[PDB]
Amino acid sequence: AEAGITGTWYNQLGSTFIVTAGADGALTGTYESAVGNAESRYVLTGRYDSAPATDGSGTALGWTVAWKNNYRNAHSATTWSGQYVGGAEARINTQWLLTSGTTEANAWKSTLVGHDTFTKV
Amino acid sequence: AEAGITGTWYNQLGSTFIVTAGADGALTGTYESAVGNAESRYVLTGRYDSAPATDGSGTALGWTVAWKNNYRNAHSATTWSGQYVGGAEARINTQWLLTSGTTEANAWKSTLVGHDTFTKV
């Protein structure tokens, strides 16, 4: 449900994620990279299931960050897809894909895959 | 069938893959790059379902190549997972993961992901 997803979260590499869950299924906020810093802040946008199957199932969700802001442009975008699991220690478990803009000849190696776990603070 | 899989297959990049399929499930052969070339050749090994289902379901299969031979060593390895579909235009549809050996600090972006379709033409 919206309330529980809203807040500040951190993953195992030390990155920050700040998010608001709206009543229509929308997600908005900010992703911060290299151990905080002032502006290595980027915009994020996503969607979640607002009427979850409830008994003890997780809530499905996902979001995108394109790595460009007013100071830097890495010419790449990452998408995270996973689930929210409430409890006394709430968690988000994800798998992610990172794609870079390449020339035709290098498109075969444009995408990296990995996984992150987020803890609410 | 095993001898359906047995042969020479080509992907959309020009790479040639030569495989022998054994009756009990073994897969063995050679992979080579640079649309031919002399020792652009590497060894491969794998496994496949030797007793598939009897409606029009494909045959599941997979294999590994480590990228070291007598002349080169790229300190990486690729695995392909997919299925075989027979008939007049037989095909092998796959997705693959490439992992490189890294230092701890570079472990987060060790793995690339992609997809390949192999035909006999």
């Binding site: 590499l13 030390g14 990155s15 990279s33 290299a34 151990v35 290595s40 980027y42 790595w67 830097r72 890495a74 790449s76 990452t78 990172l98 | 600090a105 570079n106 987060w108 972006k109």
Partner: peptide
């Protein structure tokens, strides 16, 4: 040093 990674 990509912004999704650690201080790199």
């Amino acid at each position: 040093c990509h912004p999704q990674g650690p201080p790199c």
